DNA sequence: TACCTCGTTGCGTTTGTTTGCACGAAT
DNA sequence: TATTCGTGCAAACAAACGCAACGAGGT
């Protein structure tokens, strides 16, 4: 048996993956590549990765048809003259 | 992607894709996912999406923007029916 | 019509634009102290937003405008 | 040209069309104070709108719509 | 002269917004 | 003559940093 993916579990899955990628590369090495101090990469793990992770998880659900039709109408309105 | 690519270029592509996905997701759900006041969400994107995107590029985290093709297609359909 | 929601949309747009440019940077651009931009946000911008709603002076949402630009690029250059 | 002046003219004209009573009601100012309020605040907010490029994005979108129309036609 | 290293944490600095005050204009 | 406003200034707050000390696991 299994349960379907849900957003909070996906956020946890993504946070784990992100933190592991930083650890495998190395915090100082990641800092050097990003262009901030290692103290920033270190602190971001606490201050931003949780937020970044929930945003990425929500984005995994994409756009449902109803919502896409609404966006298309809105954007088409902007791209229609007069 | 094995060569010497400048991560800033992939970072810029990631930023474009994330900004597009967030625009489709909407201000309410975005600001909610990242715990930012909706009245300063443009400011947050200004301040944090570039950093977040550079981080993802460095961690080689893929970011695809497939719903944009879908949106363009549906917008075009609306415009052509005039 | 429903001016209430439009007033709220306009207020959010104004506050978002000021924050994007920056409270201090907006002040410098306008010619007043940064403390005035901070105070205008709290005192008169909400009320001014309802006036703009009644006048039908709202503007395109910046996010949707972004999507419109992206879509136009696709329609123009995608083959 | 001078954007704030352009904005102020259009703004004051639309406000004049709206009238004293409805303008005072919209901003929550007593009718006896609305003329002074406008005299002082519209110039300030017109400047603010110019700075925030109010209306500029809409003007850009109109241009885009015309370009896209030419492609799709 | 607490093994070396490199991620975490203490702090002072840089950059950005709001609050405490008192002044001077308009009435 | 005095009250309400709207301001500029500077300090209080706030957001994020970089540098460098700290200290257990990897060397």
From Swiss-Prot, chains A, B:
Residues 27-46 bind DNA. Keywords: Activator, DNA-binding, Early protein, Transcription, Transcription regulation, Viral latency, Viral latency initiation and maintenance. One of its GO terms (molecular function) is DNA binding. GO terms for biological process: regulation of DNA-templated transcription; viral latency. It comes from the Viruses. Homotetramer. Interacts with cIII; this interaction is essential to stabilize cII that would otherwise be quickly degraded by host protease FtsH. Lambda-imm434 is a hybrid of bacteriophages 434 and lambda. The cII protein coding region is in the lambda portion of the imm434 genome. Belongs to the lambda phage cII protein family. Acts as a transcriptional activator that allows virus to initiate a latent state. Following infection, participates, together with cIII, in activation of the Pe and Pi promoters, which are responsible for the transcription of the cI (repressor) and int (integrase) genes, respectively. Both of these gene products are required for the establishment of latency. This is Transcriptional activator II. It comes from Escherichia phage lambda (Bacteriophage lambda). The chain holds residues 4 to 81 of 97 of the full protein.
Swiss-Prot record, chain C:
Keywords: Activator, DNA-binding, Early protein, Transcription, Transcription regulation, Viral latency, Viral latency initiation and maintenance. GO terms for molecular function: DNA binding. GO terms for biological process: regulation of DNA-templated transcription; viral latency. It comes from the Viruses. Acts as a transcriptional activator that allows virus to initiate a latent state. Following infection, participates, together with cIII, in activation of the Pe and Pi promoters, which are responsible for the transcription of the cI (repressor) and int (integrase) genes, respectively. Both of these gene products are required for the establishment of latency. Lambda-imm434 is a hybrid of bacteriophages 434 and lambda. The cII protein coding region is in the lambda portion of the imm434 genome. This is Transcriptional activator II. The chain holds residues 4 to 82 of 97 of the full protein.
